[PDB]
Write a protein that binds this ligand. Structure first.
Ligand SMILES: [Mg+2]
Ligand SMILES: [Mg+2]
Ligand SMILES: [Mg+2]
Ligand SMILES: [Mg+2]
Ligand SMILES: [Mg+2]
Ligand SMILES: [Mg+2]
Ligand SMILES: [Mg+2]
Ligand SMILES: [Mg+2]
Ligand SMILES: [Mg+2]
Ligand SMILES: [Mg+2]
Ligand SMILES: [Mg+2]
Ligand SMILES: [Mg+2]
Ligand SMILES: [Mg+2]
Ligand SMILES: [Mg+2]
Ligand SMILES: [Mg+2]
Ligand SMILES: [Mg+2]
Lengths: 104, 122, 147, 52, 52, 129, 187, 127
RNA sequence: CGGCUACCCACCCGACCCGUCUUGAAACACGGACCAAGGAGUCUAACACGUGCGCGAGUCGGGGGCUCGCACGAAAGCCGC
RNA sequence: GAGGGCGUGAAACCGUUAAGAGGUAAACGGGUGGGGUCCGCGCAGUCCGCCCGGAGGAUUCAACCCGGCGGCGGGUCCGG
């Protein structure tokens, strides 16, 4: 959430829950245990303020000064799609599948 | 992003049981037990799985919708089939083969349905 | 990371990775840099040539404050000022030139390098090498001193 | 008591990890593979009203 | 870059007409090395001298 | 006569002795666990005949039949119903075995669910009333 | 006994890339597939340079990557770099050229697009040129790495030209005995 | 969740203050709940105990519907003694049996001026 | 009826008591009566090199300041005139 | 089988019972044999699963269409 107004008093003692602001994020809260992918519930003003706070790849972040979004290594990365697109399979040798085991 | 999700989930994920020997994926919509890539239920855009009906009679089949991801309330559409075991085995064969939807894992769905029907009968 | 340390793997061996015969005791050769003339000269010479002796005049109370003269090259000389200026001043405007003041950026002495484009400029610095002065008069700009 | 307890991370990596964790929170197959229960939950990135 | 819409769920749980475009942080790359590394070093930051 | 799994051959073990530590017979402050003798004089390291045999990679068992019970299954430990139901697909090669700290009240429910799913449980009749 | 020949068959090559990075592992999967299904040696070299470590993928500079494409016959050929690209501050004017490389920096992408170019990543490079037709592979300055100016037979004895280790390059630090003729000897 | 910086979550300090609290705190610790009809009548959850109440046991070996009178209160042992609850020894001498006052339901009070004042403070604070 | 087993016994052959200094140990070389618990390459600074990550001719906030007094907050976040 | 230094009670060691053994001090490794405790197996009656040809009843699919929902796959990129 952003703009604290009393949501902390409401959600505070429901057990196991985490209440956490936008402009002060935590890796220790957004990925507890060093595993990625913690479930999250957002808010309207928070979810609008995210793109102001980190930007797109086209415009820089406005609230954080020198920071852009990261570079992206593989642009499209469905490996099955890439291998079964015709541009690769035009240029493949052959499926060689005879086993040719040991002959006594 | 299926391979990204696989390179994150293939180790260090939840479920995953490694106990005295080999790994058992134990995903809650899976065909076989093997933590493998072809037999994956969470990650793929198109997935097939079977489960027992809570009534006790018949086999329910869960097929992923493909119409929208990021919406798991509607992502899995479920049907119930209660037949003479041969008509339901042929029915799941038709529903896999005559659709484009996962031409692999025919026999995974078939063997799991066959085992659950034999376990269900006496 | 004691679990990744070598020492946890080295258990069960008697000498713990220092030999039975040699026996790492306390301080075999000495301490620190013992024997710089006497018995480590084959290391000190052949691995640190010049370690012993005096060379220069003795200068007392030196300040690294009076001799402060950073350098800037004719490669870097453009990007002290935004590239919009060199584009507009290079778009055949008139005989005029932009003034690039390196003392604003924090550089006192302009050294010469290569590749100065033909676009004429005016550079203000405290010091100039005759290389860079020749390069500026060759591209057609001028040298200006300050104080 | 002078053991090197605290460690410093670069701020760009501190922000990179936040971006990576938020990006991993968007995919449904990742977060079910941690152990939450999103089986009967609407959309992944939940966004309620400001009345909350 | 594919930027879908997200429908804002009301407090009753029904999707309203209000829609916010998904920000690019939910399209950022996903790096478990860097998440695990920075998580380790921040856990090292969260402790005291301890029984000496 | 329970379930009779798939084709399991005549297993060979290459030695069935679980090799003893040198001079563990002479003392009782040396437990029976193997440990590589690294002495400078030790006859076990010098491999004199008539002394004990060091374990090494030659004694290893066949990869076809590694971790095989004599009944013909490979063992797999289990605590409860879901981890029993993971073996619903592969029962004819992998037997289940209920952990030691499972109580009897849940243990009989596990063995009953295993009897429905036809999965071999190697200790089914222990800890009952 | 069999071989009185020594044992030194096991080559010290890098089979799996030692990094744990997921995107690099996926590129390894794809280019290993291409190197065993296409029989083009370009795929072999790209696969080995993807295996290769952080040091031996040194960053290309934009001016050198311009100069190697200003050579006669390489205008339409895409300059492919394994490793990263740094933007250069030296040169002013950049031509149109297409570059496929890992992790191009922000200012370098900026001035390539200001020149009007097109960059690509290796998935797009595979979808365009699987045998790598019309591609020129470039390499970075490995010996320009500053650690390689400490390595020689000595730091001083047959002139050696190899920069001894010292704290601060001034007077009174390693200048006196054996570096000048009036004090003892000279090299 | 604890929000004061001047009260302990600490197990050692809590057990130590518990087993060494003096008598005028041990009175507050040895407290009993009132029966639900009496809490309807008086609007108060709990009270300290004294020598002269009428007491029913809710759990133990001695359970249910035996409304007897307390006789002694060992605050040193955190134990009250009830008049009906007995047990013989080997030698045929009866002895009271220890009941902690959390397992105790009060059915009648002893009315006194300070008990009226405490009861009125409870009702006024519950408001 | 089948059974390996750290059960016991029989028999044939091999079979010297371990640790270390040592060119040489079964040594008429030294230490060890037996058993349980404790018991030894840690930490900091500095340097060199290899490795992994981020940014890139830059990079680094490790010193301060900024946020409401909230367990986890001695955290985390931000500064860039 | 918690009896006032009293939870759990290991080893060295000792007593007793049960088994076996005894001239080259005892102990060990390889190889077997004999006995014992105990496990499994049902003890010349133990194999199972599928398909096909035969002897019974009891059900209702299916083949065919109607009705309905959901999903697959493509097209005018129609409608946006
Ligand atoms: Mg060794
Ligand atoms: Mg030494
Ligand atoms: Mg020797
Ligand atoms: Mg040989
Ligand atoms: Mg050798
Ligand atoms: Mg304490
Ligand atoms: Mg000596
Ligand atoms: Mg001698
Ligand atoms: Mg010896
Ligand atoms: Mg001795
Ligand atoms: Mg002695
Ligand atoms: Mg110990
Ligand atoms: Mg380094
Ligand atoms: Mg006890
Ligand atoms: Mg006791
Ligand atoms: Mg006898």
């Amino acid at each position: 959430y952003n703009e604290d107004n009393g949501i902390i008093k409401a959600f505070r003692n429901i057990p196991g829950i985490t209440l956490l602001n936008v402009s002060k994020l935590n890796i220790l809260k957004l990925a507890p245990g060093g595993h990625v992918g913690r479930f999250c519930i957002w808010t309207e003003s928070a979810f609008r303020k995210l793109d102001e706070l980190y930007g797109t790849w086209r415009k820089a972040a406005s609230l954080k000064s020198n920071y852009n979004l990261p570079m992206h290594k593989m642009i499209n990365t469905d490996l099955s799609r890439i291998l079964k697109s015709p541009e690769i399979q035009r240029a493949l040798r052959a499926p060689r599948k005879k086993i040719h085991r040991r002959v006594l | 992003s299926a391979h990204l999700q696989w390179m994150v989930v293939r180790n260090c994920s939840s479920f995953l049981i490694k106990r005295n020997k080999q790994t058992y994926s134990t995903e809650p919509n899976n065909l076989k037990a093997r933590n493998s890539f072809r037999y994956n239920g969470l990650i793929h855009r198109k997935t097939v799985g079977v489960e027992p009906a809570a009534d006790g009679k018949g086999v329910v089949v869960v097929i992923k919708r493909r119409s929208g991801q990021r919406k798991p309330a509607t992502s899995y559409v479920r049907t119930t089939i209660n037949k003479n075991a041969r008509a339901t085995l042929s029915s799941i064969r038709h529903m896999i083969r005559k659709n484009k939807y996962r031409p692999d894992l025919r026999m995974a769905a078939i063997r799991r349905a066959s085992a659950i029907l034999r376990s269900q009968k006496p | 990371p004691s679990r990744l340390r070598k020492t946890r793997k080295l258990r069960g061996h008697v000498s713990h990775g220092h030999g039975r015969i040699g026996k790492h005791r306390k301080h075999p050769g000495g301490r620190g840099n013992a024997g710089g003339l006497h018995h480590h000269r084959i290391n000190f010479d052949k691995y640190h040539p010049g370690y012993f002796g005096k060379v220069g005049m003795k200068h007392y109370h030196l300040k690294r404050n009076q001799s402060f003269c950073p350098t800037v090259n004719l490669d870097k000389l453009w990007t002290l000022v935004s590239e919009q200026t060199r584009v507009n001043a290079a778009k055949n405007k008139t005989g005029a030139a932009p003034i690039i003041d390196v003392v604003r950026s924090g550089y006192y002495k302009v050294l010469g390098k290569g590749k100065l484009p033909k676009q004429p400029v005016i550079v203000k610095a405290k010091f100039f090498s005759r290389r860079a002065e020749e390069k500026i008069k060759s591209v057609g700009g001028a040298c200006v001193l300050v104080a | 008591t002078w053991r090197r307890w605290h460690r410093r991370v670069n701020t760009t990596q501190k922000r990179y990890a936040i971006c990576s964790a938020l990006a991993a929170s968007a995919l449904p197959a990742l977060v079910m593979s941690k152990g939450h229960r999103i089986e009967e939950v609407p959309e992944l990135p939940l966004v309620v009203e400001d009345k909350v | 870059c594919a930027r879908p819409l997200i429908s804002v769920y009301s407090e009753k749980g029904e999707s309203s007409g209000k829609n916010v475009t998904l920000p690019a942080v939910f399209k950022a790359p996903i790096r478990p090395d860097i998440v695990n590394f920075v998580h380790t070093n921040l856990r090292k930051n969260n402790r005291q001298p301890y029984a000496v | 006569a329970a379930l009779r799994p798939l084709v399991k051959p005549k297993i060979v073990k290459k030695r069935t002795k679980k090799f003893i530590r040198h001079q563990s017979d002479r003392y009782v402050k040396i437990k029976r666990n193997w440990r590589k003798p690294r002495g400078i004089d030790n006859r076990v390291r010098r491999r004199f005949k008539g002394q004990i045999l060091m374990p090494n990679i030659g004694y290893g068992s066949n990869k076809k039949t590694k971790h095989m019970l004599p009944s013909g299954f490979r063992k797999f430990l289990v605590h409860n119903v879901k981890e029993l139901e993971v073996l619903l697909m592969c029962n004819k090669s992998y037997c289940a075995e209920i952990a030691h700290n499972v109580s009897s009240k849940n243990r009989k429910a596990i063995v009953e669910r295993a009897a429905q799913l036809a999965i071999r449980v190697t200790n089914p009749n222990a800890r009952l009333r | 006994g069999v071989d009185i020949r020594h044992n030194k068959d096991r080559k010290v090559r890098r089979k799996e890339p030692k990094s744990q990075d997921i995107y690099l592992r996926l590129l390894v999967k794809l280019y290993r597939f291409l190197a065993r299904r296409t029989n083009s040696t370009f795929n072999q070299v790209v696969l080995k340079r993807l295996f290769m470590s952080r040091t031996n993928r040194p960053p290309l500079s934009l001016s050198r990557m311009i100069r190697k494409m200003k050579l006669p016959g390489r205008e339409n050929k895409t300059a492919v770099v394994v490793g990263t690209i740094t933007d250069d501050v030296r040169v002013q004017e950049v031509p149109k050229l297409k570059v496929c490389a890992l992790r191009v920096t922000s200012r370098a992408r900026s001035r390539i697009l200001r020149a009007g170019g097109k960059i690509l990543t290796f998935d797009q490079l595979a979808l365009d040129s699987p045998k790598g037709c019309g591609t020129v592979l470039l390499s970075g300055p490995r010996k320009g790495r500053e650690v390689y100016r400490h390595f020689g037979k000595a730091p001083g004895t047959p002139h050696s030209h190899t920069k001894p280790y010292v704290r601060s390059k001034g007077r009174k630090f390693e200048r006196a005995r054996g570096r000048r003729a009036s004090r003892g000897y000279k090299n | 969740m604890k929000f004061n910086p001047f009260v302990t979550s600490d197990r050692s300090k809590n057990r130590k203050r518990h087993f060494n609290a003096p008598s005028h705190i041990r009175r507050k610790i040895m407290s009993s709940p009132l029966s639900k009809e009496l809490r309807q009548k008086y609007n108060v959850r709990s009270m300290p105990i004294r020598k002269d109440d009428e007491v029913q046991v809710v759990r133990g070996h001695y359970k249910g519907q035996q409304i007897g009178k307390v006789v002694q209160v060992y605050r040193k042992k955190y134990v009250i003694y009830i008049e009906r609850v007995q047990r013989e020894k080997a030698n045929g001498t009866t002895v009271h049996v220890g009941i902690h006052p959390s397992k105790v339901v009060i059915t009648r009070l002893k009315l006194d001026k300070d008990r009226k004042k405490i009861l009125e403070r409870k009702a006024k604070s519950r408001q």
